[PDB]
Amino acid sequence: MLKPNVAIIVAALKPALGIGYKGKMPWRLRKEIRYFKDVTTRTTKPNTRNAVIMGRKTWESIPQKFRPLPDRLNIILSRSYENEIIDDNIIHASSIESSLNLVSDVERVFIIGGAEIYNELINNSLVSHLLITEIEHPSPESIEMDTFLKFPLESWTKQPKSELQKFVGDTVLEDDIKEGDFTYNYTLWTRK
Numbered sequence: 001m002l003k004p005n006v007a008i009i010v011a012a013l014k015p016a017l018g019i020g021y022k023g024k025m026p027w028r029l030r031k032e033i034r035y036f037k038d039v040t041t042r043t044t045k046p047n048t049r050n051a052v053i054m055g056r057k058t059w060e061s062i063p064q065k066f067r068p069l070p071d072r073l074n075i076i077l078s079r080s081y082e083n084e085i086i087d088d089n090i091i092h093a094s095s096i097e098s099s100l101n102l103v104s105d106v107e108r109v110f111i112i113g114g115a116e117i118y119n120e121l122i123n124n125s126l127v128s129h130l131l132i133t134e135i136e137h138p139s140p141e142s143i144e145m146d147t148f149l150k151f152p153l154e155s156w157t158k159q160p161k162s163e164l165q166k167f168v169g170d171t172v173l174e175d176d177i178k179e180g181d182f183t184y185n186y187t188l189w190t191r192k
């Protein structure tokens with residue numbers, strides 16, 4: 001695949017854009033996990049599937065029994081990896097672009113974490129779309145967090161919900177979803 005448009009998908013707590021704590025997610029939002037699965041798995045063309053790219057540490061954080069994530073091509077990046085096809089579902093690579101040379105019959109490509117991957121790849125021109133779940137809490141300061149997004153959002157535009165709906169197709173997008181003390185919304189951003 002030559003120069004595909006890539007999208008980053010992440011869930012972050014406003015206003016600091018915290019994303020983790022001690023190698024884990026600082027929340028358990030059941031509906032958000034379901035959204036993440038639907039958006040990353042659905043395709044429109046026929047014999048296609050999407051690709052999900054993640055850093056080695058995120059891959060290792062998924063219980064062995066539950067990886068690879070089903071119905072998607074999984075790509076794992078490590079600076080110590082040679083570019084190799086493990087099986088039909090797993091690729092090892094040392095750079096996003098080298099990995100893509102090894103794929104065919106992929107519709108969309110998603111970067112799924114973690115922090116180091118996000119913070120570095122946001123500045124790569126292949127990234128054309130950010131799918132950010134904006135999480136709000138009454139006391140964000142009480143949620144322990146150690147890992148944060150460092151995105152230059154002044155160079156990006158938040159689109160109207162209509163544009164997101166067109167992006168996701170069929171997926172149901174509920175507004176102001178509440179789960180315990182958290183309230184969240186799905187958003188789409190594109191470059192200015």
Ligand SMILES: NC(=O)C1=CN([C@@H]2O[C@H](COP(=O)(O)OP(=O)(O)OC[C@H]3O[C@@H](n4cnc5c(N)ncnc54)[C@H](OP(=O)(O)O)[C@@H]3O)[C@@H](O)[C@H]2O)C=CC1
Nearest residue numbers: 011020023024025055056057058078079113114115116117
């Ligand atoms: N809120 C959300 O939506 C999400 C949050 N997360 C959270 O992120 C945190 C985990 O993030 P983090 O620890 O930073 O780990 P990552 O998942 O980002 O893995 C980092 C590893 O990926 C490799 N790597 C990093 N950058 C590159 C690059 N540019 N090219 C090639 N390989 C690269 C290196 O592998 P090596 O060392 O082998 O060279 C590095 O050690 C946790 O808190 C986790 O829960 C994860 C996903 C989503």
Ligand SMILES: COCC(COC)n1ccc2c3c(N)nc(N)nc3ccc21
Nearest residue numbers: 009010011032033036061062112113133
């Ligand atoms: C398959 O699920 C694994 C978890 C954490 O890894 C251990 N997982 C990994 C990445 C994501 C994730 C994401 N990137 N974006 C949004 N919006 N929500 C998500 C929620 C669960 C996630």
